[PDB]
Enzyme design. Structure first.
Site, PDB file in Angstrom:
ATOM      1  N   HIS A  49      -1.048   9.601  -9.189  1.00  0.00           N
ATOM      2  CA  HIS A  49       0.233   8.904  -9.154  1.00  0.00           C
ATOM      3  C   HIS A  49       1.419   9.836  -9.077  1.00  0.00           C
ATOM      4  O   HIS A  49       1.312  11.009  -9.450  1.00  0.00           O
ATOM      5  CB  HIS A  49       0.403   8.109 -10.480  1.00  0.00           C
ATOM      6  CG  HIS A  49      -0.146   6.719 -10.436  1.00  0.00           C
ATOM      7  ND1 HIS A  49       0.652   5.607 -10.599  1.00  0.00           N
ATOM      8  CD2 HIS A  49      -1.403   6.254 -10.226  1.00  0.00           C
ATOM      9  CE1 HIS A  49      -0.086   4.518 -10.485  1.00  0.00           C
ATOM     10  NE2 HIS A  49      -1.338   4.881 -10.256  1.00  0.00           N
ATOM     11  N   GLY A  71      -2.651   2.368  -1.287  1.00  0.00           N
ATOM     12  CA  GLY A  71      -1.420   2.746  -1.976  1.00  0.00           C
ATOM     13  C   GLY A  71      -0.737   1.701  -2.843  1.00  0.00           C
ATOM     14  O   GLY A  71      -1.090   0.513  -2.829  1.00  0.00           O
ATOM     15  N   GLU A  72       0.271   2.173  -3.570  1.00  0.00           N
ATOM     16  CA  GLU A  72       1.095   1.347  -4.461  1.00  0.00           C
ATOM     17  C   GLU A  72       2.521   1.776  -4.192  1.00  0.00           C
ATOM     18  O   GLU A  72       2.808   2.973  -4.029  1.00  0.00           O
ATOM     19  CB  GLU A  72       0.732   1.593  -5.938  1.00  0.00           C
ATOM     20  CG  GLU A  72      -0.719   1.187  -6.240  1.00  0.00           C
ATOM     21  CD  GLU A  72      -1.255   1.798  -7.510  1.00  0.00           C
ATOM     22  OE1 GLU A  72      -0.632   2.772  -8.005  1.00  0.00           O
ATOM     23  OE2 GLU A  72      -2.318   1.328  -7.992  1.00  0.00           O
ATOM     24  N   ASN A  75       4.257   4.811  -6.098  1.00  0.00           N
ATOM     25  CA  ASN A  75       4.005   6.226  -5.776  1.00  0.00           C
ATOM     26  C   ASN A  75       4.598   6.647  -4.456  1.00  0.00           C
ATOM     27  O   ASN A  75       5.114   7.761  -4.313  1.00  0.00           O
ATOM     28  CB  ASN A  75       2.508   6.516  -5.705  1.00  0.00           C
ATOM     29  CG  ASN A  75       1.786   6.162  -6.979  1.00  0.00           C
ATOM     30  OD1 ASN A  75       2.181   6.575  -8.073  1.00  0.00           O
ATOM     31  ND2 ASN A  75       0.711   5.396  -6.844  1.00  0.00           N
ATOM     32  N   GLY A  88      -9.021  -6.887  -2.218  1.00  0.00           N
ATOM     33  CA  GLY A  88      -9.115  -8.182  -1.551  1.00  0.00           C
ATOM     34  C   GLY A  88     -10.309  -8.218  -0.609  1.00  0.00           C
ATOM     35  O   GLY A  88     -10.936  -7.192  -0.349  1.00  0.00           O
TER      36      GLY A  88
HETATM   37  C1  LIG Z   1      -4.499   3.507 -12.010  1.00  0.00           C
HETATM   38  C2  LIG Z   1      -4.269   2.946 -10.680  1.00  0.00           C
HETATM   39  O1  LIG Z   1      -3.153   2.779 -10.259  1.00  0.00           O
HETATM   40  C3  LIG Z   1      -5.442   2.594  -9.880  1.00  0.00           C
HETATM   41  C4  LIG Z   1      -5.943   3.695  -8.776  1.00  0.00           C
HETATM   42  C5  LIG Z   1      -4.757   3.957  -8.025  1.00  0.00           C
HETATM   43  C6  LIG Z   1      -4.071   5.214  -8.186  1.00  0.00           C
HETATM   44  O2  LIG Z   1      -4.254   5.939  -9.167  1.00  0.00           O
HETATM   45  N1  LIG Z   1      -3.169   5.607  -7.183  1.00  0.00           N
HETATM   46  C7  LIG Z   1      -2.925   4.815  -6.057  1.00  0.00           C
HETATM   47  O3  LIG Z   1      -2.140   5.174  -5.172  1.00  0.00           O
HETATM   48  N2  LIG Z   1      -3.559   3.656  -5.926  1.00  0.00           N
HETATM   49  C8  LIG Z   1      -4.509   3.211  -6.803  1.00  0.00           C
HETATM   50  N3  LIG Z   1      -5.341   2.125  -6.489  1.00  0.00           N
HETATM   51  C9  LIG Z   1      -4.780   1.071  -5.613  1.00  0.00           C
HETATM   52  C10 LIG Z   1      -4.985   1.309  -4.084  1.00  0.00           C
HETATM   53  O4  LIG Z   1      -4.169   2.381  -3.656  1.00  0.00           O
HETATM   54  C11 LIG Z   1      -4.667   0.097  -3.220  1.00  0.00           C
HETATM   55  O5  LIG Z   1      -3.447  -0.515  -3.673  1.00  0.00           O
HETATM   56  C12 LIG Z   1      -5.800  -0.906  -3.198  1.00  0.00           C
HETATM   57  O6  LIG Z   1      -6.987  -0.290  -2.707  1.00  0.00           O
HETATM   58  C13 LIG Z   1      -5.431  -2.018  -2.228  1.00  0.00           C
HETATM   59  O7  LIG Z   1      -6.528  -2.907  -2.045  1.00  0.00           O
HETATM   60  P1  LIG Z   1      -6.672  -3.753  -0.743  1.00  0.00           P
HETATM   61  O8  LIG Z   1      -6.654  -2.846   0.397  1.00  0.00           O
HETATM   62  O9  LIG Z   1      -7.801  -4.653  -0.943  1.00  0.00           O
HETATM   63  O10 LIG Z   1      -5.361  -4.554  -0.670  1.00  0.00           O
HETATM   64  C14 LIG Z   1      -4.949  -5.517  -1.644  1.00  0.00           C
HETATM   65  C15 LIG Z   1      -3.444  -5.393  -1.857  1.00  0.00           C
HETATM   66  C16 LIG Z   1      -5.307  -6.935  -1.217  1.00  0.00           C
HETATM   67  O11 LIG Z   1      -5.263  -7.856  -2.032  1.00  0.00           O
HETATM   68  N4  LIG Z   1      -5.421  -7.134   0.092  1.00  0.00           N
HETATM   69  C17 LIG Z   1      -5.857  -8.412   0.645  1.00  0.00           C
HETATM   70  C18 LIG Z   1      -4.793  -8.966   1.598  1.00  0.00           C
HETATM   71  C19 LIG Z   1      -3.447  -9.251   0.941  1.00  0.00           C
HETATM   72  C20 LIG Z   1      -3.531 -10.309  -0.149  1.00  0.00           C
HETATM   73  O12 LIG Z   1      -4.046 -10.039  -1.236  1.00  0.00           O
HETATM   74  N5  LIG Z   1      -2.783 -11.393   0.039  1.00  0.00           N
HETATM   75  C21 LIG Z   1      -3.367 -12.727   0.155  1.00  0.00           C
HETATM   76  C22 LIG Z   1      -2.806 -13.645  -0.936  1.00  0.00           C
HETATM   77  C23 LIG Z   1      -3.276 -13.308  -2.344  1.00  0.00           C
HETATM   78  C24 LIG Z   1      -2.579 -14.138  -3.407  1.00  0.00           C
HETATM   79  O13 LIG Z   1      -2.582 -15.382  -3.288  1.00  0.00           O
HETATM   80  O14 LIG Z   1      -2.033 -13.546  -4.363  1.00  0.00           O
HETATM   81  C25 LIG Z   1      -3.085 -13.334   1.527  1.00  0.00           C
HETATM   82  O15 LIG Z   1      -2.678 -12.564   2.424  1.00  0.00           O
HETATM   83  O16 LIG Z   1      -3.567 -14.464   1.762  1.00  0.00           O
HETATM   84  C26 LIG Z   1      -7.186  -8.275   1.386  1.00  0.00           C
HETATM   85  O17 LIG Z   1      -7.805  -9.319   1.680  1.00  0.00           O
HETATM   86  O18 LIG Z   1      -7.595  -7.128   1.663  1.00  0.00           O
HETATM   87  C27 LIG Z   1      -6.603   1.956  -7.083  1.00  0.00           C
HETATM   88  C28 LIG Z   1      -7.639   1.139  -6.540  1.00  0.00           C
HETATM   89  C29 LIG Z   1      -8.938   1.105  -7.081  1.00  0.00           C
HETATM   90  O19 LIG Z   1      -9.883   0.309  -6.481  1.00  0.00           O
HETATM   91  C30 LIG Z   1      -9.230   1.900  -8.232  1.00  0.00           C
HETATM   92  C31 LIG Z   1      -8.214   2.726  -8.810  1.00  0.00           C
HETATM   93  C32 LIG Z   1      -6.912   2.776  -8.261  1.00  0.00           C
END
Ligand SMILES: CC(=O)Cc1c2c(=O)[nH]c(=O)nc-2n(C[C@H](O)[C@H](O)[C@H](O)COP(=O)(O)O[C@@H](C)C(=O)N[C@@H](CCC(=O)N[C@@H](CCC(=O)O)C(=O)O)C(=O)O)c2cc(O)ccc12
Ligand SMILES: CC(=O)Cc1c2c(=O)[nH]c(=O)nc-2n(C[C@H](O)[C@H](O)[C@H](O)COP(=O)(O)O[C@@H](C)C(=O)N[C@@H](CCC(=O)N[C@@H](CCC(=O)O)C(=O)O)C(=O)O)c2cc(O)ccc12
Ligand SMILES: [Cl-]
Ligand SMILES: [Cl-]
Ligand SMILES: [Cl-]
Ligand SMILES: [Cl-]
Ligand SMILES: [K+]
Ligand SMILES: [K+]
Lengths: 330, 330
Positions: free
Chosen positions: A39, A107-108, A111, A176
């Site tokens: 981070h 990502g987040e 950061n 997701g």
């Molecule tokens: C301690 C910590 O922060 C966790 C650690 C991380 C870290 O140390 N640094 C960092 O930069 N990131 C960390 N991450 C998170 C990671 O970077 C990333 O954000 C995730 O891998 C993202 O996952 P994803 O690619 O599946 O995307 C998410 C956002 C997702 O939900 N995508 C879906 C599409 C969008 C969606 O959710 N929207 C829906 C509606 C949902 C609703 O109703 O709310 C829509 O479009 O319909 C999808 O389907 O892919 C991590 C990650 C892990 O695994 C472990 C440690 C850290």
């Protein structure tokens, strides 16, 4: 797939030297691996840190003896150049054979935004992450310089002069359904976080395996890793409250919206309900409850645990695993 | 200004674990500090490495006891984001109080081009380096989040949650007259390389002090550090030839032109004349000659040596300093 139990030593919740000492103690107690967050800004503002993970990893690998260590996770698309991420982990794995891995993800905002001012959409960040992984693999696997002009990244006669004996294992984060499928297509293993066992069993793991099969891979050789925070203390209320620091991870919008000020992330964390925390994280009063907590995630499909110690008494939170580890298997 | 004698442990000429062992041995022999190059591609192609310096530094700080360690140097403008450079060294200095520094400079095409495809002009890179230093200092020194929109870099409510007890010392590289003056204006100390004593005495140091005075600083408290390679062996011819790897550093165009393929850098290195090598680098057959070589640079104004061991017998190249160090003073 054998169950591995790892320790997540946070550089956000603890000062880096404190996290190093926890990692050394975790190894002694019997954890198989150590994982560290990567981070720039922390998930909480009060009493928080955000130490740089790569520099810390060189120190932790040197201070420990055998545990596997990997980030959890490293976003390789904006504040970090993917070729540099590839170089960093190839260097550490050459220095510490068989003990180094890397995990990547989309990502987040907390950061990436503070140091770039940019925040693309989820599908664009997922696309950038896939191209970053391609860049990393080309550099890790090529025997000659490579030139590549992607949509986001560029390689111009690039070559990694420092390579390990065998390739760095790559964990790909998917939360997701689409991210999980991408992880199966492009990662060696799955990494996930912030999901209840039901979601894992019914959506995440099935989608990950679907992605792997579409790509021609054997999902049976691909680990299912997950970061889950725990807090163990005889006083249940004290144990649950000690997880507050990490409540923001249970707010899905924090992974999509352009929110990067830890004070505002903290406001959201403080609005998370206690039942949400108890459902997603591991709150326990003793070793037996911890064993059952781990077993419910094992049954959902997780086989490489990255357990983040957020216990009131940190040292007890590590020590008690002398009783937990042999019962869950490793 | 007291004379300090440091050891430059190359991650280009040696494998990273070998360089780590050299650093440990250097500390035991009496060197005051250890310096490490920060490259993506090496100055020579044959038998070369290019390990990532920040990860290596975490390991070296953990493996050693007291020596000061700094990069030499880290280009903070393209492949690296300056805010991340600021975070990395603040983290290491918090972990190892008083033992960590960083040096910065305008870059070399061999590191930046392969992973970005871009190569701006010298004045533009110098300008970017000054803005990068501003970004690093704002992050190191601010007590509240900072927002900054520069010509090249952006900070958006950025804050360093992990800071050391006292600020990271910053060495600023200047080779030419304008770069030397910029180093005096914006660095805490001067870092230079590839210059004969005459140039140092008549151009480099005077320009650096001119820049410091223009900025309102006392040049008397600012070190004059320099990277100089040495090779010591009883057989003079063998000693001189062993410096071949680093001959390219004596070709000024290599710091300006868009040349990034180590095979072509090597062609140029192989065209450098022996007298150029003997004039700029330290070729010696014994301890007495090494002492005199160091003294001629001390007389020109250098007081913090970063000595790169390129000797045929590496261990002897380190050991012989048990005889050299006490004679040159530290
Ligand atoms: C301690 C910590 O922060 C966790 C650690 C991380 C870290 O140390 N640094 C960092 O930069 N990131 C960390 N991450 C998170 C990671 O970077 C990333 O954000 C995730 O891998 C993202 O996952 P994803 O690619 O599946 O995307 C998410 C956002 C997702 O939900 N995508 C879906 C599409 C969008 C969606 O959710 N929207 C829906 C509606 C949902 C609703 O109703 O709310 C829509 O479009 O319909 C999808 O389907 O892919 C991590 C990650 C892990 O695994 C472990 C440690 C850290
Ligand atoms: C081992 C190694 O590579 C040295 C280490 C470096 C490293 O590990 N990584 C890295 O990225 N860089 C390293 N550097 C070099 C540094 O990044 C940077 O190239 C120098 O600091 C640049 O110095 P400078 O800003 O003074 O600029 C140079 C190019 C300069 O000469 N500028 C002058 C203007 C241009 C000029 O020279 N042209 C003249 C004509 C000259 C002629 O006739 O040939 C003209 O315009 O008239 C100027 O005046 O400023 C370093 C650096 C140090 O110090 C120590 C270790 C590493
Ligand atoms: Cl702490
Ligand atoms: Cl934690
Ligand atoms: Cl070597
Ligand atoms: Cl060297
Ligand atoms: K290996
Ligand atoms: K300090």
């Amino acid at each position: 797939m054998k169950t591995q139990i790892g320790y997540f030593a946070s550089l956000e919740q603890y000062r880096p030297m404190d996290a190093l000492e926890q990692a050394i103690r975790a190894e002694k107690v019997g954890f198989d691996s150590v994982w560290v967050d990567d981070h720039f800004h922390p998930w909480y503002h009060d009493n928080a840190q955000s130490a740089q993970a790569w520099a810390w990893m060189g120190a932790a690998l040197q201070a420990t003896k055998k545990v596997f260590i990997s980030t959890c996770i490293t976003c390789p698309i904006m504040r970090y150049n993917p070729a540099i991420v590839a170089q960093t982990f190839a260097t550490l794995r050459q220095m510490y054979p068989g003990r180094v891995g890397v995990a990547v993800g989309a990502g987040e905002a907390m950061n990436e935004v503070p140091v770039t001012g940019e925040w693309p959409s989820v599908p664009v960040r997922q696309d950038m992450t896939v191209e970053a992984v391609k860049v990393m693999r080309m550099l890790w696997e090529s025997d000659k310089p490579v030139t590549f002009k992607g949509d986001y990244f560029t390689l111009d006669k690039a070559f990694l002069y420092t390579k390990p004996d065998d390739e760095v294992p790559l964990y790909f984060s998917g939360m997701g359904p689409k991210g999980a499928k991408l992880a199966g297509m492009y990662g060696d293993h799955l990494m996930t976080v912030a999901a209840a066992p039901s979601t894992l069993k019914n959506v995440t793991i099935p989608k990950f395996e679907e992605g792997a099969r579409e790509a021609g891979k054997d999902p049976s050789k691909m680990e299912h890793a997950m970061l889950i925070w725990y807090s163990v203390d005889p006083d249940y209320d004290k144990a649950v409250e000690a997880l507050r620091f990490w409540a923001g991870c249970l707010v899905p919008s924090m992974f999509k919206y352009k929110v990067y000020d830890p004070k505002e992330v903290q406001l959201h964390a403080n609005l998370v309900h206690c039942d949400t925390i108890k459902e997603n994280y591991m709150c326990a009063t003793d070793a037996e409850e911890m064993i059952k907590e781990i077993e419910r995630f094992k049954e959902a499909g997780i086989n490489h645990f990255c357990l983040g110690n957020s216990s009131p008494d940190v040292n007890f939170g590590i020590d008690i695993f002398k009783e937990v580890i042999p019962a869950v298997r490793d």
